[PDB]
Structure 1
């Protein structure tokens, strides 16, 4: 695939859906010139409020995000350079998997939970096979394309911005220790974030390290503390998560191994998730 470079005139933002550190997200419309059609899209505006740099040039890394497509990632339809960067995707109205599980909780049933572990790993495996480091995997950035199928969103976006060493800006509770301590991001550090994400699913959207201050999270990890075993998880599921949070980057599983292992468990869900 190949992403489109939009003219500013064929994009219109219509409503803010959210706002974080990696930009503001809008419901939008794509109006391709002269075709008499208005296509619903989702628009993420990235503005560098720290250093006030522009995004007028189409970098190799923006083209890399735009040449990826897979059933379990959100395709980047295109972008629109400018003083702020606009990223354009399909609009997925069903929203985020985090909100879904928080609302329905155990009513979702064990098959769907394990199936989603498979799908997120397959999406991540695709991204790894194409050399794309996500840098911000989390249950909030897994989106429902359908009631049963999810897609990994926001891959590559953190790299669109240069680091600011000015003295909360990054998602500490989802990050591998090597990323916190050294700013190093790899497919192996995406595996750590994957383990947190599937922990979010099995707890139905509990907050990781619920009541501790962010400053204290690295020290607890080095001392060997980890997210607790979810109530529905048998020891076999939890052990897959624990291997994801090894400080040794080389002991963590691969995305191929993770998709394989959740495939095997999804073949007999109640032997692995026990939902009262």
Structure 2
């Protein structure tokens, strides 16, 4: 198949500044900062991940494989890697997404999120996923926690730590063991470790459900080990209070046992987009019409305008 001609940019440590810690994990620390390429008179808001010293050879390998994947995607609804830096520990430089993860955003701003935003986000995530399908990439971890918010009007899919580029002739990815987000996974993934674009569609439905409930936990209080039999008995997540049957039927279709009967991402774009043209017909939110969310140094330029 086609040669992957993505460029991987190796950055110089003196070209970026850490301004503030965003978060700390077992992997390393994420900083908010600025990337200032020498002589270009530009300043790019970035998230910088610095791996800790104690990082194993195995962990470094997985981080570099994820970097390889992020360097190979280029779409307005998929997060962009600016580059990496090979200091004592590896640093990864991504576009800053100032409003954070979408799961938190909907929990924290629920009294101001109207139907127009919710449906637009559905369109955008469907576009990101359709692009990934075109690239023969299966994400395997789609969820509201893994969507980032550049502005309230513009979201992007992130976290390619489980993502697989399907082999040239390969139709499905077969996984081995590992720690899995059961409650977002298609039944064939839980039972048989099979992943396809159609299994990502299932996860998309669950992600939509998260948004429409303003960040409820799916199958809340139910242990992960009971999920597969609940699903086999035909039970699914409930209709969110704000959803018309039009929107709920779409989620339900994403949760069919027959993977080939689930909608395609290209059809999800179309359907949510029809609804986005008349949003109050499809989502019923009290005070919808009065809801407002935020909207937009000298040489600052967003990563999206730095090409």
Pick the TM interval, shorter chain: 0.7 to 0.9
Corresponding position of 2:107: 102
User: Could you tell me whether the CA contact under 8 Å between 1:113 and 1:202 is conserved in 2?
Assistant: yes
Corresponding position of 1:251: 261
Separation of aligned partners in 2, 1:131 and 1:60: 16
User: Could you tell me whether the CA contact under 8 Å between 1:54 and 1:83 is conserved in 2?
Assistant: no
Separation of aligned partners in 2, 1:139 and 1:102: 11
Corresponding position of 1:215: 225
Q: Are 1:42 and 2:47 counterparts?
A: yes
Corresponding position of 1:149: 154
Residues 45-86 of structure 1 deviation map (CA, whole Å, 9 limit, x = unaligned): 578x99752636997874443132112111111234688654
Q: Are 1:158 and 2:155 counterparts?
A: no
CA pair 216-93 structure 1, distance change in 2 beyond 3 A: same
Corresponding position of 2:133: 128
Aligned length: 271
Separation of aligned partners in 2, 1:38 and 1:165: 43
CA pair 26-216 structure 1, distance change in 2 beyond 3 A: farther
Normalising by structure 2, what TM-score?
A: 0.75
CA drift at 1:226: 1.0
CA pair 58-45 structure 1, distance change in 2 beyond 3 A: closer
Corresponding position of 2:120: 115
Separation of aligned partners in 1, 2:185 and 2:117: 25
Residues 68-115 of structure 1 deviation map (CA, whole Å, 9 limit, x = unaligned): 211211111123468865432111111122222112225311111111
**3-state SS of paired residue (1:256):** helix
Separation of aligned partners in 2, 1:271 and 1:22: 45
Separation of aligned partners in 1, 2:252 and 2:7: 38
CA drift at 1:193: 1.0
Match of residue 200, structure 2, among 190, 206, 216: 190
Separation of aligned partners in 2, 1:194 and 1:34: 43
Unaligned runs of 5+ in 1: none
Corresponding position of 2:97: 92
Separation of aligned partners in 1, 2:27 and 2:235: 29
Separation of aligned partners in 2, 1:139 and 1:51: 29
Unaligned runs of 5+ in 2: 1-5, 165-174, 287-307
Residues 133-176 of structure 1 deviation map (CA, whole Å, 9 limit, x = unaligned): 2221111111111121111112x32248xx7747xx32111111
User: Could you tell me whether the CA contact under 8 Å between 1:176 and 1:189 is conserved in 2?
Assistant: yes
**3-state SS of paired residue (1:205):** coil
Corresponding position of 1:230: 240
Cα root mean square deviation, aligned: 3.2
**3-state SS of paired residue (1:55):** helix
